[PDB]
Amino acid sequence: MFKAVLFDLDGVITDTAEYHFRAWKALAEEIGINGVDRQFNEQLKGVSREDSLQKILDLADKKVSAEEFKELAKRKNDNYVKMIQDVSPADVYPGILQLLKDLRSNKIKIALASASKNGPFLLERMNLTGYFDAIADPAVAASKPAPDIFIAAAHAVGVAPSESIGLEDSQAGIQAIKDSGALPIGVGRPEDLGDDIVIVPDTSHYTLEFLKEVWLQKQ
Numbered sequence: 001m002f003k004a005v006l007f008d009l010d011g012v013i014t015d016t017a018e019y020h021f022r023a024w025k026a027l028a029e030e031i032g033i034n035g036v037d038r039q040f041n042e043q044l045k046g047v048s049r050e051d052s053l054q055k056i057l058d059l060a061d062k063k064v065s066a067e068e069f070k071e072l073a074k075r076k077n078d079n080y081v082k083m084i085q086d087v088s089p090a091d092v093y094p095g096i097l098q099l100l101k102d103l104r105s106n107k108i109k110i111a112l113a114s115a116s117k118n119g120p121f122l123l124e125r126m127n128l129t130g131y132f133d134a135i136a137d138p139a140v141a142a143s144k145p146a147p148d149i150f151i152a153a154a155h156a157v158g159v160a161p162s163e164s165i166g167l168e169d170s171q172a173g174i175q176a177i178k179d180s181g182a183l184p185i186g187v188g189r190p191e192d193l194g195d196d197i198v199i200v201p202d203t204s205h206y207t208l209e210f211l212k213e214v215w216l217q218k219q
């Protein structure tokens with residue numbers, strides 16, 4: 001009965017949240033900020049580029065000019081873009097490709113609900129572009145935890161958020177799905193994502209049949 005699945009990209013479709021963390025940590029360290037560790041990174045996962053830089057600057061109460069802000073965000077993006085040039089279809093997380101094929105087979109809409117402006121490039125690297133019905137443009141969207149990206153993804157495929165399931169690996173993204181009206185299914189540790197939603201240990205658990213059951217049970 002759900003008519004759409006709204007996929008986050010980084011950390012759900014492939015291991016790209018890890019490279020974003022590495023590049024942000026590298027950027028932070030260059031400007032003398034050392035607090036970007038894996039614990040702090042849980043607050044940055046799924047957050048847009050500019051909002052992530054601001055969260056990093058805030059950690060140390062540092063202020064930069066509008067021109068230095070743009071230079072810093074660009075430097076980090078340049079590093080990250082270099083890091084992902086070799087991303088291949090072998091990097092698609094287990095179960096994701098089969099889920100995309102089964103959702104297609106059952107006429108269920110597929111949308112990307114990513115904050116990443118590098119999303120289209122990554123889907124191309126992974127030969128996944130053709131499995132997506134729409135990509136919610138991040139460029140008309142407020143950063144997660146705001147529900148904006150998930151609301152935009154659902155409507156990009158002509159479905160209401162209430163008729164959709166959202167898949168996420170981050171604290172900000174889970175909250176975004178929750179406020180969108182869509183049903184969240186997290187992937188990761190219960191210590192990071194919480195105990196109130198349905199959570200799976202790895203993406204191999206994201207099957208069409210599991211998604212149908214979670215949906216049957218929300219009722």
Ligand SMILES: O=P(O)(O)O[C@H]1O[C@H](CO)[C@H](O)[C@H](O)[C@H]1O
Pocket residue numbers: 010017020021024044045046047048049050052077114115116117118119
């Ligand atoms: O727009 P990007 O720089 O490609 O991606 C932006 O959003 C993604 C969402 O996973 C990450 O939070 C990344 O650190 C951030 O910079």
Ligand SMILES: [Mg+2]
Pocket residue numbers: 008009010011012017045046168169170173
């Ligand atoms: Mg993510």
